[model samples]
Target: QTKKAFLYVFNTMSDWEYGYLIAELNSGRYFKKDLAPLKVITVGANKEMITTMGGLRIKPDISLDECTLESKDLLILPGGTTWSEEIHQPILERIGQALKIGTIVAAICGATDALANMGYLDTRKHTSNNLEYTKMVCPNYKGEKFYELGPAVSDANLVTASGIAPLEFAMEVLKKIDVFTLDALHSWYNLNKTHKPEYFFQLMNSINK
Candidate 1:
């Protein structure tokens, strides 16, 4: 697919944040009706293997300066401790650029806080690890009035989630991309919530039929 997705990578990034999201995207199961499966492109400060906090290593498909979301489908920003530093300035600039042009920007955990600091969430309803963190880190942000107290939130071109709610985060991302039928989406949540192996079996069986 010509549709591209930029995944921001850096030192100390959370290894678990985008596992399910990327898997679904690569599995060719969640593309929009008119689009094909996204080609995941990793972006970093430089084209090198940046180490995650958990000691995982990853190389960026391209450098930050080489990224262009103007023709892309999604911009994924996974949470990391580095979100608190100025090293994310370039990435934040790109995120804002993508949002202004109506591209989807999905952010989780500390990435949500980073958005708040950038003032992108000031007029958008969104979620994060907590309101207090947003308040503390982004004291000038006025988006508290539109905050959603949930596991994850999808509002307009922006999708936000708590650090620990990766599953719910993926669900929102898939929903935004129109990935699953309503029945399948509901069934997925039910199976996850109940941990029922039978529901999974049922979903797969229905697909084969």
Candidate 2:
């Protein structure tokens, strides 16, 4: 199974941003028939207890220094004020290193701001909670040309999403990992997104309706 890591930090992380993806992976329900499911791991600057935006303190699974692209497949970054308020060049360096070795990276909200501030998403189709954020972070950012006005956007191996759309963010991550067909993806979305009768019918039809 491929391993996926969540980059976490203290006092600024949004607890809800990556919950869906984490749950989806850890549950084993989304495993591809031919491949082992993704293994979700938490990697942080340190493994010690850290407080989240929601006021909960938790310990991570591992430290950043313990990870490498050679041993991982994806790196997901959730929204956090620390991305903007602190200088963690080591994290950025690790992300860049992960990219060089073909590891997929997904960032949402403030994490997108971190990428924008460093000019990482300048050539990729990406979106954040607000477009002005990119401009404010990096005045020379040219990613505007590839900007997507939506809840989420994925280009190449980089995925970006607005802070308000964690579900869409999880959908995009699943797509990037090739976990679902378009039909299945839509079915899952519709069923969970609206709980409409039609969605249930479609889901049932896929089984024994």
Candidate 3:
């Protein structure tokens, strides 16, 4: 069966937050050769076209009501200015459904704030822009004790990251989905993380194996 990754897009979303993730998933150049290519689908809160924070216009391939967790490998939520608003509560409901069905959900930046606000991070180890920032912004948040200091964190099926750690977030999601062997995964991450010449050669060798 073909695996799928759903990217949730909305108006005013930080376009850069999903750069590495969507690219890698759609490219499949470094993925394990034996696995089927993952289908990357863009989902929106509604059918209306939305403008990104970077001013790029995107029309979602599917709407929230049409999304299904079955056969889904990952659900990606990129940080956006609209995440904290009441209009986005439906997206939160979709996240809840994804989590309940054990569908991996990768949320970054303000998207993490939405998860925390909805109490999804209460028991799961998570990291966002900042613990204090989340607490201040999310009046219903009660996950202070469970917060971790890191660029990105993953627990069970949930992955959370700070706004500045798109690389780390992508690596975590890649690992969770078993896209590459351990050696290739580490080499790929280091290559991007450090951008050193040696890491590039190492990645080439690892993926060639």
Q: Candidate 2 lDDT, tens digit per residue, 1-209? A: 34564555556789889888877766646444554546777777777777889988778888878877643387889887777555566787777777767777889888887788777877778998888756877665778877888789988778899999988998898878766555666776778789888877765454211
What does candidate 1's lDDT look like per residue over 156-197, in tens digits? Answer: 768999989988988888777665655565566668768898
| Candidate 2 TM-score versus the reference | 0.87
User: What TM-score do all the candidates reach, one by one?
Assistant: 0.90, 0.87, 0.95
Runs off by more than 4 Å, candidate 3: none
lDDT of 3: 0.86
1-209 per-residue lDDT for model 3 (tens digits): 32789998888989888998888888887777676557799998888898999999999999989978754368999998877677788878877877886889999998999999998999999999988878999898888999998799989889999999999999998888887778888988888888888988877777734
Model 1, residue 152: C-alpha shift (Å): 0.5
Candidate 2's displacement at residue 58, Å, is: 1.5
- Largest lDDT belongs to which candidate? 3
In candidate 3, position 14 carries an lDDT of: 93
Q: List the residue pairs that clash in candidate 2.
A: none
lDDT of each: 0.80, 0.75, 0.86
